[PDB]
Amino acid sequence: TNPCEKHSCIAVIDAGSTGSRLHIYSYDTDDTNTPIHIEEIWNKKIKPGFASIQPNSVTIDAYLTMLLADAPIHNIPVYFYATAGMRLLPQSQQKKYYDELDYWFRQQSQWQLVEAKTITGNDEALFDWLAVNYKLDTLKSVGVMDMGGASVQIVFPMPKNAEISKHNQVELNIYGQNINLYVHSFLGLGQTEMSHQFLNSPSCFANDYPLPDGESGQGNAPSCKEEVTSLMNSVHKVNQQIQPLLALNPVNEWYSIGGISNLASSQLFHFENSELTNQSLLQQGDNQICHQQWDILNGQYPDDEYLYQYCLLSSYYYALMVDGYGINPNQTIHYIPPEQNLDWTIGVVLHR
């Protein structure tokens, strides 16, 4: 039975840097017409990222058709929201994608496209916080981090302030509560973009890993983390931007979504209760990957295509959270299990 016959349904597409995810949600609304009882009734992922394909009609039509063809239900509103992958492209180039995508939607009737656009990382951060808090049942101090492929977001409660950019603040009324959040997104600090600066760094790879430029890995996670910290703080000034704010607005519980949940759940790392600490993350990466002999390690774990980057990723998450955001290395960080497929798209259901 189609839930959309009897309940509001929308489709939200998270067009992320590494792939697009369609979610169809059914929901009801309460007496202020705010969604409740939100349920995902369909999901479909496809790779690669929308911003990575050629922006011509044949390629874009094929991608959208592949994304939507097996949806059991249709004739519902669609929000197509691209994130940091598309943010990396100039307007002129993004325009080619949206002109072809708009045309494809206009030329068909199975989906009612509401909006297709690149959202800002600040909007993305708001959606991240709403989606995680919706799932946690908190909406009736929680910080959220989304560790993406091309950007990362951080978002936490902070009273409305005149000294910070209006761009970095959002005020929300949800289930009759007033909420003010600081939002920030760091474009270029997502895992794929960041990693392109460190691929010839021997400290960031297992011993004897073959670096692209012919040297050998000689892994050491505290050294690799220091290198990544220079990108975080000397280049993007993460610490200068975030730490004074977290100082004055401490966060009681941290939740993370994005690639860190895949790292933490992989067979190389050992965490309980879907949570980690930065100290443990760094140590595990240092001892289980950085200090291992690559050939031997690669032979032991042949079915993890991310294995080669784990010394770097563990060092990078520590640099970002501890040296960037100022989070205590012993503070618990909850991550949402990957099986949940949780991205920010719930936040779009809610806001609107």
Ligand X SMILES: Nc1ncnc2c1ncn2[C@@H]1O[C@H](COP(=O)(O)OP(=O)(O)NP(=O)(O)O)[C@@H](O)[C@H]1O
List residues forming the annotated binding site for Mg(2+): 4, 105, 108, 111, 230, 234, 267
Residues 6+ apart with CB under 8 A from 225: 282, 315, 316, 318, 319, 323
The distance in angstroms from the start CA to the end CA of the chain is 27
Q: What is the DSSP letter of 96?
A: H
Count of positions (residues) in the chain: 352
* Contact pick of 8, 9, 13, 17 for ligand X (by CB under 6 A): 17
Residue with token string 């959309």: 4
20 neighbors 164 (Cβ within 8 angstroms): no
CA 57/CA 62 separation, integer angstroms: 8
The answer to whether 188 contacts ligand X (rule: CB under 6 A) is no
88 neighbors 190 (Cβ within 8 angstroms): no
Within residues 4-23, the interface with Mg ion by CB under 5 A covers 16
Within residues 214-273, the interface with ligand X by CB under 6 A covers 258-259, 262-263, 266
Pick from ligand X, its own copies, Mg ion, none: which does 263 bind, CB < 5 to 8 A by kind? ligand X
Residues 6+ apart with CB under 8 A from 21: 13, 14, 43, 44, 45, 341, 343, 345
Per-residue contact flags (x/-) with its own copies for residues 161 to 190, judged by CB under 8 A: ----x-x-----------------x-xx--
Per-residue contact flags (x/-) with Mg ion for residues 127 to 156, judged by CB under 5 A: ---------------------x--------
* Contact pick of 108, 120, 262, 331 for its own copies (by CB under 8 A): 120
CA 151/CA 142 separation, integer angstroms: 21
CA 88/CA 348 separation, integer angstroms: 22
Per-residue contact flags (x/-) with its own copies for residues 88 to 117, judged by CB under 8 A: x-xxxx------------------------
How many residues form the binding site for ligand X (CB under 6 A)? Answer: 22
Helix (H) or strand (E) holding 210: none
CB of 304 to ligand X, least distance (A): 7
CB of 109 to Mg ion, least distance (A): 29
Nearer to its own copies, 131 or 231 (CB): 231
Q: What is the DSSP letter of 236?
A: S
**Coil vs helix vs strand at 205:** coil
Farthest CA pair distance, the chain: 64
Per-residue contact flags (x/-) with Mg ion for residues 292 to 311, judged by CB under 5 A: --------------------
Q: Which residues bind its own copies (CB under 8 A)?
A: 48, 52, 54, 87-88, 90-93, 118, 120-122, 150, 165, 167, 185, 187-188, 193, 196-200, 210, 212-215, 227, 230-231, 234-236, 305, 308-309
